[PDB]
Design a protein around this ligand. Sequence first.
Ligand SMILES: Cc1nc(C)c(-c2ccc(CC(=O)Nc3noc4c3CCCC4)cc2)[nH]1
Length: 315
Amino acid sequence: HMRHRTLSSSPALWASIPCPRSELRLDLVLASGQSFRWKEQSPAHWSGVLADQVWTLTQTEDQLYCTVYRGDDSQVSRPTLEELETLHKYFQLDVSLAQLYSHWASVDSHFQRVAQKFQGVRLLRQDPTECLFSFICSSNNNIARITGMVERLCQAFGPRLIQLDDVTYHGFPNLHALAGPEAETHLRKLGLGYRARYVRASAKAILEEQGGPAWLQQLRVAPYEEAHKALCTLPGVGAKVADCICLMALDKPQAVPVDVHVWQIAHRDYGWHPKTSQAKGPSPLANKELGNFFRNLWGPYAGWAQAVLFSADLR
Ligand SMILES: Cc1nc(C)c(-c2ccc(CC(=O)Nc3noc4c3CCCC4)cc2)[nH]1
């Protein structure tokens, strides 16, 4: 019935945002393990869902073209200003990535080499709910498997938005959908495994102990230190997952998630070791030290610099 759009197929439905390639490269951002809801359905065209709406995104050297599928049998048209403001805030284009890319590299000979090839890797401003349960699904996993777990989760529990070609799109579910007495067994069948317990338990915990999605908006305005400790009370959410949420959803640019991939990068590319801590390998105290090393090295936007290295280490 409906179909995925491209820029040549129907240019009347697209709207442009002025954006240099040095500020944003979609191919290095949308599938670099921040969001798991974007797929290149057509070449150079990234389709995905963003707060109960489907988008398709493409670009030139200095323009970010975008088109919206509103669904609900509505009148097909260009994106509105309010809708393009949502996209402008999603990519965080008010913040200059070029000035960050120069402030990093002043004290970082490694980033200087990496910034040449992988330019325009910016940090997305995601929904807290979507971000939280997506990174509970990330434990001991890869981008391919996580994308599957999140998609199947959204199909079962999330509301239906629109179908395009052979791809039925779903918005991310609310806390109440995941918190019920049937969700763990359902999510296990969908293939989350042990992660099914934490999805349900954290959803039930946020709703009953903390008081619903409003709590995540309190954590947004609350400081990084409090929000991190607060998230660590949740089932299946430790320092790593809390830092992912803090960085990508709660506007904490200094948050540095420490799993094993930063350990590999920090060790191989910076020659870092646990100096103060006696343990040679990963541990709560050593992971905390590694976050402080990168915060001291890069500054208050340390997590944004980490995202450039994560995108570079994948390719
Ligand atoms: C071989 C290989 N190298 C790497 C770096 C991966 C890899 C990448 C990404 C993910 C999903 C994930 O956890 N992403 C992030 N976690 O904290 C951050 C992110 C993205 C950037 C900001 C902070 C899992 C594995 N695989």
